[PDB]
């Protein structure tokens, strides 16, 4: 599935609802720590609407159980991410992904 490990706690009550827009900062890396993408390198947050299949399942289920302010470590199985095909040239086949993602606010 996806494992969620807390780095810094959120307020414990403000969670995202389906259809809400989640504003996050993320740094993504392969399980060996090789970074492939980071919103912090760009200084601008990432937005996506929850429960719309805009993002991979691991993000949908992982971020859903985070509360505002919380910085967590998402360990995502290839099943909840890019699968056997992966993403050609970027993410290899059958890759477990690790995202450092902080839920900044809900809109």
């Amino acid at each position: 599935g996806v494992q969620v490990e807390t780095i810094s706690p959120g307020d414990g009550r403000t969670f995202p609802k389906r259809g809400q827009t989640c504003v996050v900062h993320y740094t993504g890396m392969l399980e060996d720590g090789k970074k492939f993408d980071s919103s912090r390198d760009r200084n601008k947050p990432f937005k996506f609407m929850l429960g719309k299949q805009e993002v991979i399942r691991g993000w949908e289920e992982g971020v859903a159980q985070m509360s505002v302010g919380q910085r967590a470590k998402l360990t995502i199985s290839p099943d909840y991410a890019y699968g056997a095909t992966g993403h050609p040239g970027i993410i290899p086949p059958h890759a477990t992904l690790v995202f450092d993602v902080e839920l900044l606010k809900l809109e």
Partner: protein, 94 residues
């Protein structure tokens, strides 16, 4: 048919990103995008096409260039640079 450039690029980009990101279809991605870039090439004929062009014209032309570079290089990195610009214009059109 008659279509606003605002609307044409919105649905066009949604389609292209579905095909590339969702279905791994880069050939199909080129199919939907090329017509929209061709329309821009003949140039604005209304006030609404003129204002759209003034706002988003440079970004779209630059994105087409990164697609063009991908074509020669094989560097998937060049396609992502195109989509960075496409995402940018999309989220302003919305």
């Amino acid at each position: 048919v008659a279509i606003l450039w605002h609307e044409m690029w919105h649905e066009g980009l949604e389609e292209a990103s579905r095909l590339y990101f969702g279905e791994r279809n880069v050939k199909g991605m080129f199919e939907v995008l090329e017509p929209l870039h061709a329309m821009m090439e003949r140039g604005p004929q209304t006030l609404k096409e003129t204002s759209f062009n003034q706002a988003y014209g440079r970004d779209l032309m630059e994105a087409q260039e990164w697609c063009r570079k991908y074509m020669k290089s094989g560097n998937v990195k060049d396609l992502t640079q195109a989509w960075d610009l496409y995402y940018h214009v999309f989220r302003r059109i919305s």
